């Protein structure tokens, strides 16, 4: 089989920068290489075929080239809507094979998150489990530390985070942290607090509530 070795795996640049992604075939594939774009929740979309030809409707800022077994995808002026994963594929021999991909992200100015907390709903409490949600909205860069405290005791092992992919409009991220407890345990305690550390904040921010307060 032929393999396609793609580099780098991750690349971050500012709006308007020229970015370069590469793919190396393990043996001669002539010009039989295509490049695809994959946006969040999307299917792969053809950008370039036969190494260097622009597919209909694809912006002219995309270009591809070949040198021997080395293939290059260039985006001449990176745009916010270009954030996606990019894949090369050879069709020179069967099986056609794909590169492992390159994730492209945007650099923008630092933005502190808006921090919100949601106590468990009354509906949920009826069923014996409590979920407490901490929401970090529209922030940059992605790094952020979120700690849970219950009556000032640091929680561990009982929370999970989910983080959106970078937003193609404002280039920010959002993140949820969910703390899960039994209804009984949630009712044993009063103070629920989520503490957020992020580069855009001058010091960490704690958002909290007392169980029972309206």
């Amino acid at each position: 089989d032929i393999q396609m070795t793609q580099s780098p795996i991750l690349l971050s640049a500012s709006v308007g920068d020229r970015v370069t992604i590469t793919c190396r075939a393990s043996q001669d594939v002539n010009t039989a290489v295509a490049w695809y774009q994959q946006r969040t929740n999307g299917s792969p979309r053809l950008l370039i075929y036969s190494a260097s030809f622009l597919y209909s409707g694809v912006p002219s800022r995309f270009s591809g080239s070949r040198s021997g077994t080395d293939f290059t995808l260039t985006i001449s002026s990176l745009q916010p809507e270009d954030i996606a994963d990019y894949y090369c594929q050879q069709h020179y021999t069967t099986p056609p094979t794909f590169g492992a991909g390159t994730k492209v992200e945007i650099k923008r100015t630092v933005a502190a998150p808006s921090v919100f907390i949601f106590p468990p709903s009354d509906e949920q409490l009826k069923s014996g489990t409590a979920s407490v949600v901490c929401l970090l909205n529209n922030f940059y860069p992605r790094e952020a530390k979120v700690q849970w405290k219950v009556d000032n005791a640091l929680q561990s092992g009982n929370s999970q985070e989910s983080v959106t992919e970078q937003d193609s409009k404002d280039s920010t991220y959002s993140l949820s942290s969910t703390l899960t407890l039994s209804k009984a345990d949630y009712e044993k305690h009063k103070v629920y607090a989520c503490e957020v550390t992020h580069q855009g904040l001058s010091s960490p921010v704690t958002k909290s509530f007392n169980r029972g307060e309206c």
Binding site: A32, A34, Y36, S43, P44, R45, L46, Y49, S50, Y55, Y87, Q89, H91, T94, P95, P96, T97, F98, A100, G101, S114, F116, I117, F118, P119, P120, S121, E123, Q124, S127, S131, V133, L135, N137, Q160, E161, S162, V163, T164, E165, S174, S176, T178, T180, K207, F209
Partner: protein, 220 residues
Amino acid sequence: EVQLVESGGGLVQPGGSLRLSCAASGFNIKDTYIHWVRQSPGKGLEWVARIYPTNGYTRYADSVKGRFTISADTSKNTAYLQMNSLRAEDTAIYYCSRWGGDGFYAMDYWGQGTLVTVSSASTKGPSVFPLAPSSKSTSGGTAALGCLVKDYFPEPVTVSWNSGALTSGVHTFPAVLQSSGLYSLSSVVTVPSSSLGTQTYICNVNHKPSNTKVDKKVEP
């Protein structure tokens, strides 16, 4: 307008069987190759099979040979993938694509993809709970509210707001697999604080594997 639409994906037990369909329109599959390609955490994008419906010639990936078969019915302009003796590593999004269409030597159209999940665990519909706006979810004159979609299997669930009328400011988080082996996710949206109590907000949740359709009103 060229379109490919996959269907038949779903939860199947190890060793079980499933049949996927790929319905083509805006072109004739007799004029092109049709491929199945899958995408998974383990192998990323991995070609599965191809057929040239004009003459019936097929090729398969070594990893599926004997277990999967590709076929095409030109009269229905539809391609199929029979999948037998399924294993955990077959769990993936399955796409169909065309190659050689209009003389373009690449996969120029791909379907939306259909999710195949190989697992012994049972289907379970989610519970949908309000994430009510409050003094603890508001700042700068904007308020956050949402819906917590808890304890389902398998993926996927979809969430929309006000029947798709509300899209601005919505974040639906990627699903997380809980320790219980069930998935959970939240969808949130931020709106003007002044609209709370006058504008209605409903999250529309659908979990097709369990036939669960919930429209949850979220109130202060």
